[PDB]
């Protein structure tokens, strides 16, 4: 019966700058007998296990970089980073465990940089996928910043939005950029009628769209 | 070193029951508490309870969300921890971690194990198909298809993991009771196709392992 709110639930930063996330509880988690907080934070990189940054509000994990500071008392506290790194792209996690156990909801924290283009490449179906009837076209859009990106799928030049997946990385530890993968699946039968296969990516970064294709008789 | 390592996760259908284990090392298991906490897919993290120490008589607690249907327990003689899951609902489908939690005197999770993916579904186990994606000037960029498979997850290696900078595999997406992903990897133009590139794709729900060697078509 704690319960446990963090803010903002997301935000993003540029490398070198200083940023604050809150963390607000229920109750005090002040142990009175003890003279000290049962709160920490956790740390959970994409695809990663939670990693122990902070405990006791403010007592830095060993191998934990001196960047990260635990402050607060009571039923307010907050983790500081004061000069964000790319590698610090993760998901802040606060939690008491002055009664039992009870985490946040979590602070998303993104880092901001420099526009960048995507690089795109275009790839055909593969024989043994054709051989099983069906057809998939893939699209990648690799390294590009900011997030949003529109692509629009061409088949002998005219626009085809039926059978499109879509699906965006997470962002990237090193160089902030995102990645997305385009796949146009078809039938083998549709596939075989048309020519010309075009996988056009619009981005902030260029008026001019990018565009990768292939012609199925120049054998994908 | 401190190791943990979840395991017993995969598919189980709506109303079944699932036992996970936790197996630990490289430090006094009886002196601490243990907890096991969950997450679904893109979502917060949630504590679901946990079982007491030695000195504590290795007695257990639990969130209100999962008291009454979930059980926590304990071998000491193998430093191993269990999560009995009962009347499973599409809720409960999570990534499930085990966490080393108090030990009379520290207020913190200091280890936490690689987490066991558990889905709750009706829908039928189904392999991958795993297809080659190969191009048609510096940097020269490859993929791999991993297509139409279920439960999660699936893992993509790029040469058995001794590729590992330049490769982005995307979220798998679902789409009518199945899964697609892909991966790509981007390597200097002079070692492909001079030296080989090849994507190992496993998926442990039906046992399967593939490797797809990428060749110029
Ligand atoms: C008067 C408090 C006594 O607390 C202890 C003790 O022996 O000092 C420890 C308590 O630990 C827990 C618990 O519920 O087991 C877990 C801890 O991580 C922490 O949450 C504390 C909480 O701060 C309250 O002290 O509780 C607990 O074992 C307690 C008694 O055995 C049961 O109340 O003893
Ligand atoms: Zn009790
Ligand atoms: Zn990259």
């Known amino acids: 019966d704690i319960v446990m709110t963090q803010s903002p639930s997301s935000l993003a930063v540029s490398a070198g700058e200083k940023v604050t996330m809150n963390c607000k509880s229920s109750?005090?988690?002040?142990?009175?007998?003890?003279?000290?907080?049962?709160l920490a934070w956790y740390q959970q990189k994409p695809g990663q296990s939670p990693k122990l940054l902070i405990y006791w509000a403010s007592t830095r994990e060993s191998g934990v970089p001196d960047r990260f500071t635990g402050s607060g008392s009571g039923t307010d506290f907050a983790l500081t980073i004061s000069s964000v790194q790319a590698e610090d792209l993760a998901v802040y996690y606060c939690?008491?465990?002055?009664?039992?156990?009870?985490f946040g909801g979590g602070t998303k924290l993104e880092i901001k940089r420099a526009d960048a283009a995507p690089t795109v490449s275009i790839f055909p179906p593969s024989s043994e996928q054709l051989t099983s009837g069906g057809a998939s076209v893939v699209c990648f859009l690799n390294n590009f910043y900011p997030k949003d990106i529109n692509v629009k799928w061409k088949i002998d030049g005219s626009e085809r939005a039926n059978g499109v997946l879509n699906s965006w990385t997470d962002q990237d530890s090193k160089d902030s950029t995102y990645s997305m993968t385009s796949t146009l699946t078809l039938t083998k039968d549709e596939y075989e009628r048309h020519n010309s296969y075009t996988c056009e990516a619009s981005h902030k970064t260029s008026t001019s769209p990018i565009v990768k294709s292939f012609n199925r008789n120049e054998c994908x | 070193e401190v190791k943990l390592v979840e395991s017993g996760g995969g598919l189980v259908q709506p109303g079944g029951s699932l036992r996970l284990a936790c197996a630990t090392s490289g430090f006094t298991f009886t002196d601490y508490y243990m907890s096991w906490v969950r997450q679904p897919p893109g979502k917060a993290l949630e504590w679901l309870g946990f079982?007491?120490?030695?000195?504590?008589?290795?007695?257990?607690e639990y969130s209100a969300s999962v008291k009454g249907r979930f059980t926590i327990s304990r071998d000491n003689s193998q430093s191993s921890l269990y999560l009995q899951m009962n009347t499973l609902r599409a809720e409960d489908s999570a990534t499930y971690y085990c966490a080393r939690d108090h030990d009379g005197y520290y207020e913190r999770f200091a280890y936490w194990g690689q987490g066991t993916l558990v889905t709750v579904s009706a829908a039928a186990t189904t392999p991958p198909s795993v297809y080659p994606l190969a191009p048609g000037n510096s940097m020269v960029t490859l993929g791999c298809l991993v297509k139409g498979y279920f439960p999660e997850p699936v893992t993509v290696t790029w040469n058995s993991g001794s590729l590992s900078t330049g490769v982005h595999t995307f979220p798998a997406v679902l789409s009518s009771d199945l899964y697609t992903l892909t991966s790509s990897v981007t390597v200097p133009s002079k070692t492909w196709p001079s030296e080989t590139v090849t994507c190992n794709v496993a998926h442990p729900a039906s046992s399967t392992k593939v490797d797809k060697k990428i060749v110029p078509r």
């Open positions: 939690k008491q465990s002055y009664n039992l156990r009870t």
């Open positions: 109750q005090s988690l002040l142990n009175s007998r003890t003279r000290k907080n049962y």
């Open positions: 079982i007491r120490n030695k000195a504590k008589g290795y007695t257990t």
